[PDB]
Design a protein around this ligand. Structure first.
Ligand SMILES: NC(c1ccccc1)c1ccccc1
Ligand SMILES: [Zn+2]
Ligand SMILES: [Zn+2]
Length: 582
């Protein structure tokens, strides 16, 4: 408790000595409260006018238009201690999983040099603005690195002064850039060196890309076994126990020297003991602590969520296969049985899963998995929108399974080759492309963000009639040589000024390991759509009068946007589609 968090608490006390007050009307039950201090401040979603002018039929669809308008009674909940049998299953499984993940990888420190390059090309490293403006400026000033040095030597000493979270089914924990550096130095190797790639982790999909995920689910479907299960956890980050944080820390057992000590300090000082500042309107700033739940950078959060989810799902598979009888307590021979299962079939069981942080698909040996709930519930990974003890409903067809907010279609090209394509309700795709985040967007920057959405649609969603047409329209309306942008950046092959047919060929044919015949496609007309009825089922306006008028008059919409942007060099992409090819 207060010996580890005191210094951080003591330090904040003094910067607001003219405001400190142990409030008695404090709303916290499960967060330990420490004091308050005076503040006053808040970014809402702005509309992308280039995308909206080229998607007029959607201006009257509430599921689209409502997306641009506008649980902290779940951050303040508590998760019970698992039973001794559960704690044992988790420790055995975690020990075994870090060893498998480490067989072909070497833990290593990430560098100031590497950190500097990331900030100078904009990755969402959730930092705060103070002493320097942007992260870009802090990183080119030795003063910063002297602050980093002081904290670093403090961590080697087993103490923390400045690693404090700022809080804002979502809650995002910003830290100052220096704390983010020290987290990246110690734990960045998990993401930088692809520990959760499918090749390395067998269940993982890190780096895979939306054009790969469907093929991966189809490969899992080919295994003998029961239904495919895709149970969502209710508020995964809030259900991470101190026991979970201690099994995650066992990655430090694979480290050495300075690195081992630096990583141990991140886990002890910042993860297993946390200090947070929260805005309360009654506007004060509350300084609260707790030992459990997930609060890390979003990139480390992803890798450790994947790890703990892989562990939880192997244990649920063990329960279904009868490897252990009860979570209350493991006998000695049950320990040897669990160990033996892991050594004997562990890698086969990992290959039966697709796991992306808190999101999973599992194809177990059989449907006993559906009612194997005791370990899952006792670890605190309670399923969303189903009663605690009601058996999971599985999916019989891999094309119906939800994963990473998508489902996947099998689409046969006129030439017989097979594409497995990502899909989601088209209102969600149009509604998201119509939104920009933050202020000070020029017309050119707004146009380049529209172009990023358009090129993503041409690569991932070409099979949706409305999206291939709208993508072609946006790419016709934005100057040909302007570079697609995004202020928050899976693999992003659409972020390029290369011709999109050449990128399509590279992604779907040349580099696609499931495509034996490498014959290039010569035009967009060779590239198929979903069935017309399947397109409607997934939200296509195809067959409406509004959509027919939009399609027929599309050059008029393109010319409206070209007139606003001004006298620039444009390309007409509409004749790449049969109906505008004269
Ligand atoms: N004629 C339309 C239709 C026919 C039958 C069912 C649904 C739409 C149609 C099809 C494909 C593209 C554009 C319009
Ligand atoms: Zn610190
Ligand atoms: Zn679909």
């Amino acid at each position: 408790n207060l010996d580890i968090i005191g210094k951080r608490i003591e330090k904040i006390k003094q910067e607001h000595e003219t405001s400190w007050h142990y409030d008695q009307d404090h709303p916290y039950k499960t967060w330990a409260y420490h004091g308050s201090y005076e503040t006053k401040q808040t970014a809402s979603s702005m509309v992308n006018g280039v995308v909206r002018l080229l998607t007029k039929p959607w201006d009257i669809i509430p599921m689209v238009t409502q997306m641009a308008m506008t649980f902290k009674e779940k951050v303040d909940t508590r998760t019970q201690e698992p039973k001794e049998g559960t704690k044992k299953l988790m420790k055995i499984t975690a020990e075994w999983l870090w060893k498998e993940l480490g067989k072909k990888k070497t833990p290593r420190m990430c560098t100031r040099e590497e950190f500097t390059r990331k900030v100078r090309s904009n990755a969402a490293l959730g930092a705060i603005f103070n002493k320097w403006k942007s992260a870009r400026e802090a990183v080119e000033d030795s003063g910063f690195w002297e602050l980093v040095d002081k904290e670093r030597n403090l961590h080697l000493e087993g103490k923390c002064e400045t690693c404090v979270y700022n809080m804002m089914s979502r809650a995002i924990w910003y830290m100052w850039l220096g704390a983010r550096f020290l987290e990246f130095e110690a734990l960045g190797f998990l993401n930088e060196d692809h520990w959760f790639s499918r090749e390395n982790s067998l269940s993982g999909v890190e780096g895979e890309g939306l054009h790969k995920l469907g093929y991966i689910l189809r490969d899992v479907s080919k295994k003998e076994g029961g239904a495919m299960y895709a149970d969502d956890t209710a508020g995964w980050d809030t259900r991470i126990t101190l026991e979970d944080l201690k099994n995650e820390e066992m990655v430090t057992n694979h480290m050495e020297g300075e690195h081992k000590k630096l990583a141990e300090a991140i886990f002890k000082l910042t993860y297993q003991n946390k200090v947070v500042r929260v805005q309360r309107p009654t506007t004060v700033m509350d300084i609260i602590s707790r030992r459990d739940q997930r609060g890390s950078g979003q990139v480390v959060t992803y890798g450790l969520n994947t790890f703990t989810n892989m562990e939880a799902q192997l244990i649920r598979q063990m329960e279904g296969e009868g490897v252990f009888k009860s979570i209350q307590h493991l006998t000695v021979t049950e320990e040897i049985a669990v160990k033996n299962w892991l050594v004997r079939v562990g890698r086969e069981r990992l290959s039966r899963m697709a796991i992306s942080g808190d999101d999973c698909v599992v194809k177990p040996l059989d449907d006993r998995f559906a009612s194997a709930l005791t370990a899952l519930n006792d670890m605190g990974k309670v399923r969303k929108d189903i009663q605690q003890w009601e058996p999971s409903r599985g999916w019989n067809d891999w094309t119906q399974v939800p994963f990473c907010s998508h489902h996947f279609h099998e689409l046969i090209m006129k030439d017989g080759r097979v594409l497995v394509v990502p899909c989601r309700n088209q209102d969600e795709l149009i509604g998201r492309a119509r939104i920009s985040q933050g202020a000070g967007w020029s017309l050119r920057e707004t146009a380049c963000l529209g172009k990023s959405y358009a090129q993503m649609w041409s690569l991932m969603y070409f099979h949706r009639r409305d999206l291939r047409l709208a993508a072609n329209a946006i790419c016709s309306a934005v100057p040909s040589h302007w570079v697609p942008t995004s202020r928050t950046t899976a693999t992003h092959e659409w972020m390029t000024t290369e011709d999109m047919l050449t990128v399509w060929n590279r992604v779907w044919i040349q580099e696609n390991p499931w495509m034996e015949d490498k014959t290039p496609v010569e035009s967009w007309e060779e590239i198929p759509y979903l069935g017309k009825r399947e397109d409607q089922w997934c939200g296509s306006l195809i067959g409406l009068t509004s959509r027919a008028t939009w399609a027929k008059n599309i050059q008029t919409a393109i010319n409206q946007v070209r007139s606003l942007i001004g006298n620039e060099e444009y390309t007409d992409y509409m004749p790449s589609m049969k109906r505008f090819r004269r």
